[PDB]
Amino acid sequence: FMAQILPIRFQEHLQLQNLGINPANIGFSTLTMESDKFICIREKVGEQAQVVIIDMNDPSNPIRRPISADSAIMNPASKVIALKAGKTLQIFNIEMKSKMKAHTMTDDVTFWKWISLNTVALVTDNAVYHWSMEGESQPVKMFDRHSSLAGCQIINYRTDAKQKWLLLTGISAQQNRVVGAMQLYSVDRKVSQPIEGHAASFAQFKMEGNAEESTLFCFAVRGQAGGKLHIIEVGTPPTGNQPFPKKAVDVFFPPEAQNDFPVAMQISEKHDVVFLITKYGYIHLYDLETGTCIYMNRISGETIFVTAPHEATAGIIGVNRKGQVLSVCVEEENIIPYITNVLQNPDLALRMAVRNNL
Numbered sequence: 059f060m061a062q063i064l065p066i067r068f069q070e071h072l073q074l075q076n077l078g079i080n081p082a083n084i085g086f087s088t089l090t091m092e093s094d095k096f097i098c099i100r101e102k103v104g105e106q107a108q109v110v111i112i113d114m115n116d117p118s119n120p121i122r123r124p125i126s127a128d129s130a131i132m133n134p135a136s137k138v139i140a141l142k143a144g145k146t147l148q149i150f151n152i153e154m155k156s157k158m159k160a161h162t163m164t165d166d167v168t169f170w171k172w173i174s175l176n177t178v179a180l181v182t183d184n185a186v187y188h189w190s191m192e193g194e195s196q197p198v199k200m201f202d203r204h205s206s207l208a209g210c211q212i213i214n215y216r217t218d219a220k221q222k223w224l225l226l227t228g229i230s231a232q233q234n235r236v237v238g239a240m241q242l243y244s245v246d247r248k249v250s251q252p253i254e255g256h257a258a259s260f261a262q263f264k265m266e267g268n269a270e271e272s273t274l275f276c277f278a279v280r281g282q283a284g285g286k287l288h289i290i291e292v293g294t295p296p297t298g299n300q301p302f303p304k305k306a307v308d309v310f311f312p313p314e315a316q317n318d319f320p321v322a323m324q325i326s327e328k329h330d331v332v333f334l335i336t337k338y339g340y341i342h343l344y345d346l347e348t349g350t351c352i353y354m355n356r357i358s359g360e361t362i363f364v365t366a367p368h369e370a371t372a373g374i375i376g377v378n379r380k381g382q383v384l385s386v387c388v389e390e391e392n393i394i395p396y397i398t399n400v401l402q403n404p405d406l407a408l409r410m411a412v413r414n415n416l
């Protein structure tokens with residue numbers, strides 16, 4: 059019953075191979091998507107290093123230039139790009155064709171990412187730094203790396219909106235298993251906590267009855283107990299708030315997907331829904347308040363290796379290994395019908411309508 063309506067809208071936005079990208083460069087080491095505004099690809103054509111910027115508002119006109127960099131990340135919003143070569147980092151203003159700032163690190167930066175409109179996080183083998191793109195400031199060390207992530211491939215770093223909670227995520231091969239290792243750091247406490255996790259995100263959520271938003275930490279893991287997802291408030295509730303009761307739910311994997319595991323998460327600011335993507339190209343939806351699983355489906359035939367928030371729909375946008383650029387968001391008009399008649403969870407249907415963010 060109601061087999062035809064879905065709680066999500068799937069969209070294809072682009073096929074990068076149709077825009078002249080070599081499929082060999084459609085991967086984590088050469089293609090970045092730091093927000094839904096831009097895709098940046100490093101390509102070696104003949105002997106020439108080139109960097110291609112796809113403006114998602116004008117994608118059929120990619121800009122391609124000879125630029126030598128080990129890594130290239132567009133600003134989430136501005137026409138500004140961070141470039142790295144060896145231990146030397148530069149931030150460049152594209153629109154004004156001008157160098158903004160440069161810095162030479164002592165240690166190699168193995169992973170970097172824009173964490174805000176104006177700040178780029180730098181991960182080295184032993185520490186994490188934040189670097190403002192503005193003014194004269196140098197990178198500032200935020201914390202030292204926990205031994206539990208030693209030797210990991212770093213896969214993500216992110217913060218809460220207030221930049222008081224910092225999360226570093228790595229994976230390692232333990233025999234034939236991919237084991238996720240996170241470090242959660244409290245700026246104010248100066249304390250780290252090691253956490254077995256594969257994908258996470260922070261979120262701000264206003265509980266019924268509270269005047270102030272709660273800062274939530276959501277992570278998903280496939281460990282020895284199977285797939286689990288946790289939704290936890292970090293630190294102490296804002297003055298006047300009740301605390302958010304911790305939620306813990308299973309994360310399902312079908313029998314034919316024993317080697318699947320979580321790889322990405324984004325949280326809808328408008329809908330209070332967690333989007334979880336797996337290595338095999340499945341998407342899951344969970345309610346942020348309860349952890350309730352809303353929907354699961356395989357949405358991509360290829361691994362989706364990078365994601366970002368999709369701002370226009372308060373959804374998730376990603377790029378798969380073949381170059382499909384795809385998004386998923388809540389279908390606002392069919393979500394409650396689906397919850398009512400397919401999930402048959404009227405409490406969730408009621409709570410979503412009472413939030414009234416549809």
Ligand SMILES: O=S(=O)(Nc1nc(O)c(Cc2ccc(Br)cc2)s1)c1cccc2ccccc12
Nearest residue numbers: 109110111121122123125139150152155156157
């Ligand atoms: O749009 S650009 O400004 N194109 C450029 N092409 C060349 O050749 C540039 C050369 C240049 C060297 C030194 C300075 Br200072 C300024 C520009 S800048 C640009 C700058 C930085 C990174 C880019 C990556 C992909 C596409 C264009 C890029």
